[PDB]
Structure formats: structure tokens, C-alpha cells
């Protein structure tokens, strides 16, 4: 879905596809600015080493220190909305200036 | 999840417990008798990545 830690477009967001009118093909959208995404696994996990054979160790979760919270990623709301505005302008260049891009 | 794991000696077993994610654990039956298996056990061998 999202391309991470790649190259940015030199000038404008680029829309690339093998056939832009063939809906079986993917569209690769290359941003000209990065959108920062902050991902975390907030649980302070332990590691439990179980010997399962001669020198064969299995690494298990064991337990969690503290409470248990859900892993998540944050993005800036304004930066993402600006990025999609640029994406829809470039998509309209292919699908029509008066098309509703959902 | 608690299970009977092998040890360095083939004539000895150990009781081990570990936390697993729901995504990695598949029920064996509908009856909520705590019996579960790893998701891969019916179709694939699983190898541990080197830490």
C-alpha cells in the first residue's frame, strides 16, 4: 500500500501505470515530499529463551512489562491531506479536470 | 499458551508457556477447551529467524 524510505519526485507528484485506463494494473504514485509516519509497539516486551535441542533456542515473548497497548502509526493530518490534494490534481490530469476523485 | 516442549535430552520434556498473538494461533475445535495450534502447522514447516 504505502512505499516507505524510497526516492522522492524531483518536481511534482508522479502518477505511473502500465496502462492508466486498465483497471487490472496498479498505479504507482511517487511523492515529491515525504510524509513522515511514526510507528510504535508500545508494549515493553520480554524475551524468554527455551532450549529445544542441542544448541537450538526458541525465543518466546514470555511476558509483557507494564500494561498492554495497541501498536499504531501516526501521520500528520495536514501533511497527508496536502499530499492527497497533490495526488488528486495529478490523477485529474489523467481522469478529467472535473472528476470526483474518491 | 502452555505446551509440552522438547529439551536437550530426547527422553525429557519441559512445560513451557509463552504469549502468542491471536493471528498466530488457530483453534483446533469450536469447544472453548483452550486447545489451539499454530497457524502454519497444517500447511508449512516454520523456521525461526536468527535473532
Amino acid at each position, epitope marked *: 500500500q504505502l512505499l516507505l524510505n524510497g526516492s522522492l519526485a524531483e518536481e511534482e507528484v508522479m502518477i505511473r501505470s502500465k496502462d492508466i485506463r486498465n*483497471n487490472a494494473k496498479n498505479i504507482l504514485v511517487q511523492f515529491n515530499t515525504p510524509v513522515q509516519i511514526n510507528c510504535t509497539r508500545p508494549n515493553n516486551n520480554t524475551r524468554k529463551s527455551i532450549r529445544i535441542g542441542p544448541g537450538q533456542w526458541f525465543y518466546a515473548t514470555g511476558d509483557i512489562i507494564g500494561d498492554i497497548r495497541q501498536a499504531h502509526c501516526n501521520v500528520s493530518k495536514a501533511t497527508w491531506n496536502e499530499t492527497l490534494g497533490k495526488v488528486v490534481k495529478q490523477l485529474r490530469k489523467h481522469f478529467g479536470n472535473n472528476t470526483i476523485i474518491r | 499458551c502452555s505446551f509440552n516442549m522438547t529439551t536437550e535430552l530426547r527422553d525429557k520434556r519441559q512445560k513451557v508457556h509463552a504469549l502468542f498473538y491471536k493471528l498466530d494461533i488457530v483453534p483446533i475445535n469450536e469447544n472453548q477447551n483452550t486447545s489451539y495450534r499454530l*497457524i502454519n502447522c497444517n500447511t508449512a514447516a516454520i523456521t525461526q529467524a536468527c535473532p
Partner: nanobody
Amino acid sequence: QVQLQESGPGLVKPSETLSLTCAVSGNPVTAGFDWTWIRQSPGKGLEWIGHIYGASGSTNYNPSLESRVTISRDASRNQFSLKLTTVTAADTAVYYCARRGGDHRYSRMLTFTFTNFDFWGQGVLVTVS
């Protein structure tokens, strides 16, 4: 939610190819769902024919039919279709298209083995004669 509709010839002659197309309204055929074909011979129970996974194009066929069955999708029409070759008298049946579905909360390793055909069409009765 999701509307499936079968369309195709209602009569095929022996040794010809049967081509049935299922139109999907409300859900892309490029979605990671198993788009399936199932048939029911008159007076008999349901028989699964096969499926195509919409997000990759990978297919699976009933081993008794596999050599004569091709399943494909067309994203530009949002259709999927069954191509059943060398039809015989035994192939007369009501053919249904369905969505295997799955559960987005579970890994593909598990939802691959689900038989939760959540959405069904009405079916096409195909007579081989």
C-alpha cells in the same frame, strides 16, 4: 452490500466450451477475495468448481475438474468468469458465482481455508444437449 449476477449461455452443445461471466456490483474484483464458481446438478447437492483470488490472480480448481476449468477476472468490467471445456452430459447443472470472502481480521494462512460463501447470485441453469 455486494450484488453478484451470472450471465451466459443457457445451453451448450457436447464438446464445446461453456463460458459464464459473473458481474460484481459493490465490490472490486481486484479485492483480495476468492471469487468462486460452484455448481449443483439437478437433484444433487452443491459442488465447488474453483476460485480466483482477486488481489493476485492465483487460482485453485477442484481436482476432478481442474484440467477442464479456467477461472479469470477482468478489472475493467469488474467481472469474473468460468471457462469449462469439453462439456458432457454430466456437466448439466445450475451454475452459481459466489464470493468466498474471508475475514480481514485473520491471516491469509487461515482465511484461505474458509468456506464462508457470504454472497451468492441466483444461478444459470445450463443444459448440455
